[PDB]
């Protein structure tokens, strides 16, 4: 199916210091490939995959300054924006960024997208085509009128259709031994007594990739939501992922109760039930 | 691989 | 040499459309500019283009096809100050070096 | 207000050194240098931003620049070659559009 490359941009004000802290990360679909450290002693992209070792310096060399780059232009707009908003220079502030590609199953370009926060609320951003920008207050609108006049979204759109897509295209195929694999999910199920005519049935997910999962309870076919305890899918550590349901039944009408896993990995939905 | 001509504010 | 164009000179007779071509080879190539420079003088640039298709500017017409990997540029209704050398140039994405032709010599005759 | 260079021309002997001087554009922050051989194309040098710099061309260690806190920019080459003969251009941008806009050059002639 999709597939898509993100880039991810933190910079933080360290009034007591000189420096902002400065973090990018690049991910293929769920899989980090790429790391920047303003903190790290290095001062260069890092690789996170087996399959981006393989580029020459050529690569590197470019990855080091496009985001010196970055770093250096949030840090000139930490700046600006303190400005704007009339805030002082005792105030630890936050920009972040994102951006990139998606495509279809068939590897063509999708959807793009690039966005641009200050303290967590949007700042700027631009819309779905990629022609405008998307202003929340009116600082926002003085950056899109500049913007505007200097062609920033042509280039980014150029970007964004285009060269990020090819680079996507690139990676897919060089490490497709781990990007275009799927991994099924191992599963269990857990009965534990909470009360004394009441106990908490959950049903594991463990081990499967990409992050995409359906975890779900039915009571009879009717599926249970606000009854379901659900947690966020998390990372195993090992590029893979995890994730659990819970709920709370009355006791011996626990046959009544299914867990229902959907996944790209598996061939046909699993149904678990509570066997002994 | 990342974008050149980030633009500031 | 990754930009290349042709020497010329091109002869162009006065009132009649000049055309330049340019090809490159390397896919990062993302944005692309034409300088015009005369005779004992400094490179000016004259346009800039930054997304596939044509773009006109008065009597300037720029066309980037980057499937097949050229720019062109037509000038309409030719001048004897047209006259000059026509330099192309690509960004790529992997940096912020602009890489140029030889540039192509532009004659227009009366 | 436009792009400056000095000297516009000069005359150097082989082996000396050269020191060649660029002010950007007002309101233009980055500068670039260009060496441009007669009937060529001009071939990147270096580019400056924030005094550092950024990126580097095919030129060897001779060749050093500087970069000031007005965001002028100085070019100097030493052991200068016959082979160094050309129109150094400097290019001024912003870091918005990053539109390079050149100035009138300084031409260098090395004789023996």
């Known amino acids: 199916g999709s597939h898509s490359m993100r880039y991810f941009f933190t910079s933080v004000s360290r009034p007591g210091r000189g420096e902002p802290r400065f973090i990018a990360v690049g991910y293929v679909d769920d899989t980090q490939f790429v790391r920047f450290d303003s903190d790290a002693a290095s001062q260069r992209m890092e690789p996170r995959a087996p399959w981006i070792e393989q580029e020459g310096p050529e690569y590197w060399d470019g990855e080091t300054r496009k985001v010196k780059a970055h770093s250096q232009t949030h840090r000139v707009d930490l700046g600006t924006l303190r400005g704007y908003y009339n805030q002082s220079e005792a105030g630890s502030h936050t920009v972040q960024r994102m951006y990139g590609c998606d495509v279809g199953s068939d590897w063509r370009f999708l959807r793009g997208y690039h966005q641009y926060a200050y303290d967590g609320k949007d700042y700027i951003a631009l819309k779905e085509d990629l022609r405008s920008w998307t202003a929340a207050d009116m600082a926002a609108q003085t950056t899109k009128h500049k913007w505007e006049a200097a062609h920033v979204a042509e280039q980014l759109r150029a970007y964004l259709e285009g060269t990020c897509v090819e680079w996507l295209r690139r990676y897919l195929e060089n490490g497709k031994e781990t990007l275009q694999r799927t991994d099924a999910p191992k599963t269990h199920m857990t009965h534990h007594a909470v009360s004394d005519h009441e106990a908490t049935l959950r049903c594991w997910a463990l081990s499967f990739y990409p992050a995409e999962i359906t975890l779900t309870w039915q009571r009879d076919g009717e599926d249970q939501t606000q009854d379901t305890e659900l947690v966020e899918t998390r990372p195993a550590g090992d590029g893979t992922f995890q994730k659990w349901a819970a709920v709370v039944v009355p006791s011996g009408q626990e046959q009544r109760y299914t867990c229902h896993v959907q996944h790209e990995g598996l061939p046909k939905p699993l149904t678990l039930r509570w066997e002994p | 691989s990342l974008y050149n001509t980030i633009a500031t504010l | 040499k990754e930009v290349e164009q042709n020497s010329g000179p091109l002869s162009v007779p006065e009132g009649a459309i000049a055309s330049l071509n340019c090809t490159y080879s390397?896919?990062?190539?993302?944005?692309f500019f034409w300088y015009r420079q005369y005779s004992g003088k400094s490179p000016e640039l004259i346009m800039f283009?930054?997304?596939?298709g044509d773009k006109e500017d008065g009597r300037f017409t720029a066309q980037l096809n980057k499937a097949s990997q050229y720019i062109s540029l037509l000038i309409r209704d030719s001048k004897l100050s047209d006259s000059a050398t026509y330099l192309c140039?690509?960004?790529?994405?992997?940096?912020?070096?602009?890489?140029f032709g030889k540039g192509t010599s532009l004659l227009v005759t009366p | 207000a436009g792009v400056t260079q000095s000297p516009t021309h000069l005359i150097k002997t082989r082996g000396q050194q050269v020191t060649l001087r660029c002010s950007p554009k007002?309101?233009?922050?980055?500068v670039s240098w260009y060496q441009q051989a007669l009937g060529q194309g001009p071939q990147f040098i270096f580019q400056?931003?924030?005094?550092?710099?950024?990126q580097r061309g095919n030129f060897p260690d001779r060749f050093s620049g500087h970069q000031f806190p007005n965001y002028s920019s100085e070019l100097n080459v030493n052991a200068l070659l016959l082979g160094d003969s050309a129109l150094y251009l400097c290019?001024?941008?912003?870091?918005?559009?990053?539109?390079?806009?050149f100035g009138p050059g300084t031409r260098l002639t090395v004789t023996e």
């Open positions: 290019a001024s941008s912003d870091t918005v559009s990053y539109e390079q806009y």
């Open positions: 390397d896919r990062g190539s993302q944005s």
């Open positions: 283009i930054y997304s596939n």
């Open positions: 140039a690509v960004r790529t994405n992997s940096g912020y070096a602009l890489n």
């Open positions: 007002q309101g233009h922050d980055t």
């Open positions: 400056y931003y924030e005094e550092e710099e950024r």
